[PDB]
């Protein structure tokens with residue numbers, strides 16, 4: 001079937017102020033529900049939700065992507081690759097109830113942007129206009145990446161999302177957040193100790209820790225450090241491949257560069273597949289609760 005064009009359509013009469021309110025509600029709930037996942041907070045899972053709801057995109061036919069907000073449908077909601085994201089969706093339920101006018105795609109992506117910024121990460125410009133599409137537009141499972149592969153797999157996988165080497169290495173840096181949960185993915189352990197703080201620790205740990213390829217309780221291999229951290233085979237491939245290695249070293253030695261590159265790559269990820277009218281509003285850059293004195 002001929003590829004569909006998804007034109008961003010601003011929620012009727014809404015502007016920057018309306019979305020800053022949604023951002024604020026999400027940020028305030030992030031601060032309030034601090035006990036989740038042994039006090040890590042919902043920050044990490046919201047970022048992963050934003051990425052998985054966007055990562056189903058296929059540049060070849062524009063199927064999948066953040067536009068339709070199809071994660072709300074069971075086929076995608078139950079994707080084995082999305083195990084654990086239900087926690088992020090449940091967190092957003094009261095937010096959507098208070099602001100019923102925002103589309104699901106805008107909420108899922110804004111959730112990721114809000115989480116990154118509130119966790120002291122870079123500012124990430126965000127554009128509104130995603131429109132909910134029917135259940136039959138939900139992409140089949142299997143479009144998200146496996147974690148037991150090598151650099152070649154990673155490089156090829158991300159080409160479907162139109163991401164180059166630099167974009168891939170920067171995006172993977174999001175693993176500086178949260179952790180793996182055996183029950184969800186068959187992997188257990190965090191990548192960093194300050195896992196609700198967005199920084200370049202993921203790269204520093206990958207480069208400086210002494211890693212051992214071990215098997216976890218799910219019989220899957222993962223690199224472990226005596227410090228109590230892990231690196232998935234796909235994460236570790238970033239230092240096995242010489243092209244990826246150079247970029248990993250770059251980010252480990254330049255916090256600002258990582259922030260700038262991650263911001264661009266993350267916005268791109270969240271906007272893939274969307275056509276923005278020439279007269280659409282400019283991207284929004286939301287103030288953090290801290291910047292607002294809230």
Ligand code: HEM
Nearest residue numbers: 044045048051084146147171174178179180181184185234
């Ligand atoms: C080769 C690519 C990638 C693979 C194979 C991968 C794999 C995984 C796995 C296995 C988990 C653990 C899930 C769980 O058990 O709860 C995870 C968590 C996470 N991933 Fe990735 N990931 C990849 C890329 C990315 C990217 C590009 C982002 C976003 C920019 C990202 C953000 C996250 C976050 C924030 C978490 C933590 C979730 C939490 O703590 O609840 N991942 N990923």
Ligand SMILES: [K+]
Nearest residue numbers: 176192194201
């Ligand atoms: K961190």
